[PDB]
């Protein structure tokens, strides 16, 4: 049930219930339909879950703040350590900056 500390305390709570669906707990707005979130049980079928939650915990509690300092020698680092590929790491690194960005405009 400044941002990095919040990301972990949040993502960690995004597993002990599903992948849960509490996405509709702090949103007074309305939804769309039900035949759409059905593709959420698909990823659950596999013995695994997602690649994101992999290389996510495979990083220092300071390397997630400014992933910009990460180079070609740092991407392959959290790549083999998590089992993912260099490409699967980029999509993850280029996101940590988005959260800390779009948040500023909020």
């Amino acid at each position: 049930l400044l941002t990095l500390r919040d990301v972990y305390a949040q993502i960690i709570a995004l597993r002990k219930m599903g992948p849960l669906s509490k996405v509709l707990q702090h949103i007074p707005g309305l939804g769309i339909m039900l035949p759409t979130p059905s593709e959420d049980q698909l990823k659950i079928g596999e013995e695994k879950i997602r690649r994101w939650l992999a290389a996510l915990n495979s990083m220092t509690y300071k390397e997630l703040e400014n992933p910009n300092i990460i180079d070609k020698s740092r991407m392959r680092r959290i790549a083999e350590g998590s089992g993912l590929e260099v490409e699967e790491v980029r999509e993850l690194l280029e996101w940590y900056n988005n959260m800390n960005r779009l948040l500023k405009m909020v």
């Binding site: 996405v23 702090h26 949103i27 007074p28 707005g29 990823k43 997602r50 994101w52 996101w95 988005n98």
Partner: peptide, 14 residues
Amino acid sequence: GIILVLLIWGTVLL
């Protein structure tokens, strides 16, 4: 209000 509604809803894309 609307924060992660347009954030985490995009993590499943990749």
